[PDB]
Amino acid sequence: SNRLDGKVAIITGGTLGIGLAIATKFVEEGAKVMITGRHSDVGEKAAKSVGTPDQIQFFQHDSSDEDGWTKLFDATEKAFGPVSTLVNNAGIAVNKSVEETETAEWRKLLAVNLDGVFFGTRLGIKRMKNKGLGASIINMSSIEGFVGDPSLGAYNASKGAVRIMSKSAALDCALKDYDVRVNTVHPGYIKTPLVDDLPGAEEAMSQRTKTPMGHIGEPNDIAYICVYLASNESKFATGSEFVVDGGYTAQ
Amino acid sequence: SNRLDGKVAIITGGTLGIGLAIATKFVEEGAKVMITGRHSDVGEKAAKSVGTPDQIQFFQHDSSDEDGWTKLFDATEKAFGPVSTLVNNAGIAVNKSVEETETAEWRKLLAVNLDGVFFGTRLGIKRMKNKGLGASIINMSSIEGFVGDPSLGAYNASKGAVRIMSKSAALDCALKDYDVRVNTVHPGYIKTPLVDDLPGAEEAMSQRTKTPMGHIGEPNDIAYICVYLASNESKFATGSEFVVDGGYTAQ
Amino acid sequence: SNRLDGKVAIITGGTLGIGLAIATKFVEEGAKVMITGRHSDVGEKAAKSVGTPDQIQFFQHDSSDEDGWTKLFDATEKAFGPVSTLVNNAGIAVNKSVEETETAEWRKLLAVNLDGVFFGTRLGIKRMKNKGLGASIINMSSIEGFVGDPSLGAYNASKGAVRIMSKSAALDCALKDYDVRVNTVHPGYIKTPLVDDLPGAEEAMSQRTKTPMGHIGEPNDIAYICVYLASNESKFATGSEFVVDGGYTAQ
Amino acid sequence: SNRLDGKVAIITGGTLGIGLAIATKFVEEGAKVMITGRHSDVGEKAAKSVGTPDQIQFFQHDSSDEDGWTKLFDATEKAFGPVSTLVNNAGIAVNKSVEETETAEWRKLLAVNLDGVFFGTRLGIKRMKNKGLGASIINMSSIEGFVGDPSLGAYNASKGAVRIMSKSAALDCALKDYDVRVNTVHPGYIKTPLVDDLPGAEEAMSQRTKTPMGHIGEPNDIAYICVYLASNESKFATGSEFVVDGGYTAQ
Ligand SMILES: [Mg+2]
Ligand SMILES: [Mg+2]
């Protein structure tokens, strides 16, 4: 407890699923949190479900919107003071092979999944460096940052990009003594209402040939590794990949 | 010799440097080759320097140009018959940290380095599958597909994307018995006229803390691994990463 | 706090350095701990420095001693009840290239660094499986489990072995629903009294070409990732590699 | 053709399967070859099946026998002149989980699979360095050097050790300008008479969840990557891992 004392976090796609669990555990550990999402009705309800406005607020934002990133950092500083912590979690999927990926699908996925993490990481470095905040940028990749899936071509591209781009940012921040760390988190299959809405998905993901543990994870599994990475407990971790996948990538 | 008997190869950025060496060794090994480049004066001279038009021709193309990919495959089939082999080699660099990367620089680099490889891989699968060609797509990544460089943020993103996207394509092609392989090649530092034009670059690259062998490679070092991957010698290799880097990534 | 409620941990080489910090943070988080070491004078003093015998005790043991592993598990159960948690941390180094490694040096290093982790992991699975303990085996590898060092040949062999052997154990435990996780921790350079005793070592390790952060870590940097892995917070993490290295392996 | 002009190769376990195919393609490419094996009846027949004694000879040797390595290098120099090329291919498997691995099984597997590669690599560096031979040490790892198999615990340990130890040797040889390269080859499932003798094995290995290509490889698939690595074509490749696995590790 109080593991995130004084931390001020932005979590993109923080209104649902993994992002909401990260926001929930962040507030529990003493962080101030701004969550983002596309819909104000969902986002304001999600903030209120976690805590009071002195603990957590909502900011409506598409991670692909470059100018909106400026407004997001400005809104978070006004509410909570200087931002110490960014979780780039907002993401979309396309269920296509490379072969069957339309160019519009490709561009839209990379706008959210790659441009979003680039915009957030670039602005985060500028706003958080040289302030003694113990600043941490946590870029959400996935098992699809390590291994191919034949039906997630564009997604694989975006997750491989986030994985290695994050190492560039980590090195630059370390060599320049910016007091900013950059790490990637790589979830395997995680049970969310969205997974619950695709009949057969959880059973398919739970097969031993997919997830050796024979079941999928829960949003809190990703929340706890993010608390570690946001905390000063991980002050010697930068440029690293943290996998929580029930053994998916070990076989 | 005759290691590429009957193969028909497209090599993007085949008019200079690594691409020109791949084209040269491909023709030597019995492949028909279409090289691409931005300038007709350079490209036609480069084709003529390797062989006769019955062996190698030039096609003017920016790898970022989606519609031009169609014209490139059509031109290669008309000259040489069905394409068996694609080397996605065309690439550009931006010398910026993530922090100092302009959005226009970011978009332009990903247009050539990521869109280019996606357009080529997608069209290549469609044109080469189910024809018993022993088809091979060779996607040029680099050491920057494995490790960060603090001053190559966008480049790291593009090379990490190509690395993992290529595994998606490899798996889909394998599971569907397309008779198409997809592999990545990861050069370290290679001496080219372009490296020779940056004073101090070769010495910096040749430092033991960069390249343990204490010298950089030559274009033929990349040509020979590409001959292996284009040939039926590698018919059980797909979804794999082939590193030729003088030990850069081993330390 | 109370993050290791009810956990019973064995930590090999727990009387000094990283092992002592893991033991210290384990007790702080509510775990009962048995630390091992070669010397009773050091080990008993180390236990007393952390807490009372109801919290932490010492057991004299060489990790290479197969029969002594039985006595270690028996002693820990008698003191604390069923063992939930094993940290295989005991290790030695040889400062030789492969070329200059004597066979006796080779065998002795692999006896502690590889046999030790095998004996501990094998016995740990047998004693901890199917008991609803939320059991966790944490095998200490290092950056030398990922990358070569020209002067640590035998050490590289042992750390590469622990890295991949741990994935085998993880998969078997997951597929058989043993309620046992196996993960590896990969420290970079960590300041210890032993590092302080080699003049010039910390400066050499702190060079940007070695550790991008430009300084080395402290034992608590490894303690905190071990608390995460021992805790039920990591119940979906198995077969994974957790790197805490100041950016060493990111470049 | 003549890709191994003037090369003098030792191939351990060169009398059967993958080793025999490497020996066959080595002789075809102009290398002189000494193959090793346990039985003189098999070994002499295997040598004669490939070529004349001026091309290839047999030397009876257990790779775990340290003193016999000296006699092997002496016999090869006497027959063929200075050794340029070592393929550490001799290996055994144990079909046990870590949990079910007997200590005698463990020690015997590591004696052949790890001690063997260490003895060969150490002696090879000493005998081949500083002679302008374009010397190459090719250490046979496997897919089990990258990923766990729950029923190959000891094998995983040995293959992870060879993988990272080989990088140490590569770096030392590069930094000291020894004119010796060290690389690892990582076969997936390969059809051999031994695989043909285990009913159901090839079908199990050929499942899409194991080998995406839906079939296993043949010994020549490993022979061709070994020709590349032995040849001066790979003179900028050291400390690298070459995977030929039908997509096993890409998913
Ligand atoms: Mg896998
Ligand atoms: Mg490195």
PDB file of N, CA and C and ligand atoms in Angstrom, chain A residues 147 209-210 247-251, chain D residues 147 209-210 247-251, ligand 1:
ATOM      1  N   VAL A 147       5.410 -13.061 -30.999  1.00  0.00           N
ATOM      2  CA  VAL A 147       5.085 -14.175 -31.930  1.00  0.00           C
ATOM      3  C   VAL A 147       3.984 -13.721 -32.887  1.00  0.00           C
ATOM      4  N   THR A 209      -2.663 -25.820 -26.164  1.00  0.00           N
ATOM      5  CA  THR A 209      -1.826 -25.431 -27.328  1.00  0.00           C
ATOM      6  C   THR A 209      -1.786 -23.904 -27.475  1.00  0.00           C
ATOM      7  N   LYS A 210      -2.672 -23.177 -26.796  1.00  0.00           N
ATOM      8  CA  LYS A 210      -2.639 -21.693 -26.770  1.00  0.00           C
ATOM      9  C   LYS A 210      -2.082 -21.248 -25.414  1.00  0.00           C
ATOM     10  N   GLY A 247       1.928 -18.778 -19.954  1.00  0.00           N
ATOM     11  CA  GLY A 247       2.873 -19.694 -20.624  1.00  0.00           C
ATOM     12  C   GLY A 247       2.794 -19.664 -22.143  1.00  0.00           C
ATOM     13  N   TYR A 248       1.974 -18.784 -22.731  1.00  0.00           N
ATOM     14  CA  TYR A 248       1.701 -18.773 -24.197  1.00  0.00           C
ATOM     15  C   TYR A 248       3.028 -18.774 -24.966  1.00  0.00           C
ATOM     16  N   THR A 249       3.930 -17.847 -24.629  1.00  0.00           N
ATOM     17  CA  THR A 249       5.195 -17.632 -25.379  1.00  0.00           C
ATOM     18  C   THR A 249       6.316 -18.552 -24.872  1.00  0.00           C
ATOM     19  N   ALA A 250       6.133 -19.309 -23.783  1.00  0.00           N
ATOM     20  CA  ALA A 250       7.180 -20.215 -23.256  1.00  0.00           C
ATOM     21  C   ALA A 250       7.247 -21.509 -24.078  1.00  0.00           C
ATOM     22  N   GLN A 251       6.196 -21.873 -24.829  1.00  0.00           N
ATOM     23  CA  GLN A 251       6.191 -23.092 -25.691  1.00  0.00           C
ATOM     24  C   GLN A 251       6.294 -22.673 -27.161  1.00  0.00           C
TER      25      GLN A 251
ATOM     26  N   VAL D 147      12.523 -22.307 -26.725  1.00  0.00           N
ATOM     27  CA  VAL D 147      11.227 -22.550 -26.035  1.00  0.00           C
ATOM     28  C   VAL D 147      11.328 -23.843 -25.226  1.00  0.00           C
ATOM     29  N   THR D 209      -0.340 -27.087 -34.667  1.00  0.00           N
ATOM     30  CA  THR D 209      -0.028 -26.514 -33.332  1.00  0.00           C
ATOM     31  C   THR D 209       1.438 -26.781 -32.962  1.00  0.00           C
ATOM     32  N   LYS D 210       2.119 -27.678 -33.671  1.00  0.00           N
ATOM     33  CA  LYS D 210       3.571 -27.918 -33.477  1.00  0.00           C
ATOM     34  C   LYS D 210       4.327 -27.264 -34.638  1.00  0.00           C
ATOM     35  N   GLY D 247       8.310 -23.037 -38.913  1.00  0.00           N
ATOM     36  CA  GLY D 247       7.455 -22.046 -38.229  1.00  0.00           C
ATOM     37  C   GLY D 247       7.210 -22.347 -36.758  1.00  0.00           C
ATOM     38  N   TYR D 248       7.832 -23.392 -36.199  1.00  0.00           N
ATOM     39  CA  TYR D 248       7.547 -23.871 -34.816  1.00  0.00           C
ATOM     40  C   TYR D 248       7.627 -22.691 -33.838  1.00  0.00           C
ATOM     41  N   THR D 249       8.730 -21.939 -33.878  1.00  0.00           N
ATOM     42  CA  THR D 249       9.012 -20.857 -32.898  1.00  0.00           C
ATOM     43  C   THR D 249       8.385 -19.524 -33.332  1.00  0.00           C
ATOM     44  N   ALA D 250       7.807 -19.404 -34.534  1.00  0.00           N
ATOM     45  CA  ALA D 250       7.185 -18.142 -34.998  1.00  0.00           C
ATOM     46  C   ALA D 250       5.797 -17.955 -34.372  1.00  0.00           C
ATOM     47  N   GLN D 251       5.145 -19.018 -33.874  1.00  0.00           N
ATOM     48  CA  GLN D 251       3.811 -18.921 -33.211  1.00  0.00           C
ATOM     49  C   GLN D 251       3.982 -19.110 -31.700  1.00  0.00           C
TER      50      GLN D 251
HETATM   51 MG    MG E   1       5.480 -20.605 -29.380  1.00  0.00          MG
END
